[PDB]
Structure 1
């Protein structure tokens, strides 16, 4: 059922299926499935409405989530522009942020490739 934000998992274990949220990892899922006492191996497909809510409430209230987050991070990085620290440009200049080479690799933070010529 609809847990977080405008969210609906399905037809798989709840532990796994909880995962399908932005902010719910494999760790926060264990934590929730015992601090509200729901066996994890059950398929969503068949679980109490008593339990869909005891989940719902735990989750939205324990922590920041599903696009509240997407906006927070969004809002963080736009601050790293500030007056302008290092990590700022870097984000501004779409380059690796955490002190690692750019001569080779840096593919994950760069557009496929952008080949040219050279060498004589």
Structure 2
């Protein structure tokens, strides 16, 4: 409807989970320069959140940074339907949970090294550097 007069609280690069973000990019992404989140947990944490889906990554009230660091990380509460998921049943600690940013990188990790203690064939064929899904790959 117009060019919106963005004052500077347009602030021009952003930081969400230590893990970089850019600040005049159209949001749902930006939440996608991340691990473990991608335009589907992202278009829920914005609908269960009081959001814009067309705002940028710099243009962020902060009451919409800390509620959007927050649903994330929680999972079951602002209706997160649990099929929606990756840490689908822990199976070591159940649980209904989300594997995140720094954390999908050290849990990718801790799922291989409950089946390399074993000595089986879902994390021994990851072990020879060659693939486990059953195929003949030679070409690649």
TM-score, with normalisation over the residues of structure 2?
0.66
Q: Which has the higher helix share?
A: 1
Q: Which residue of 2 aligns with 1:113?
A: none
Q: Which residue of 1 aligns with 2:116?
A: 81
From 41, 44, 56, the equivalent of 1:31 is 44
Moved over 6 A (4+): none
Q: Which residue of 2 aligns with 1:9?
A: 21
Root mean square deviation of aligned Cα: 1.7
Q: Which residue of 2 aligns with 1:68?
A: 103
Alpha-carbon distance in 1 for matches of 2:106, 2:69: 21
TM-score, with normalisation over the residues of structure 1?
0.75
Is 1:22–2:57 an aligned residue pair? no
Alpha-carbon distance in 2 for matches of 1:34, 1:93: 44
Alpha-carbon distance in 2 for matches of 1:13, 1:50: 20
Unaligned runs of 5+ in 2: 1-13, 76-97
Count of residue correspondences? 104
Instruction: Identify which of structures 1 and 2 has the higher relative contact order when contacts are C-alpha pairs closer than 8 Å and 6+ apart.
Output: 1
Alpha-carbon distance in 1 for matches of 2:45, 2:126: 34
Unaligned runs of 5+ in 1: 108-120
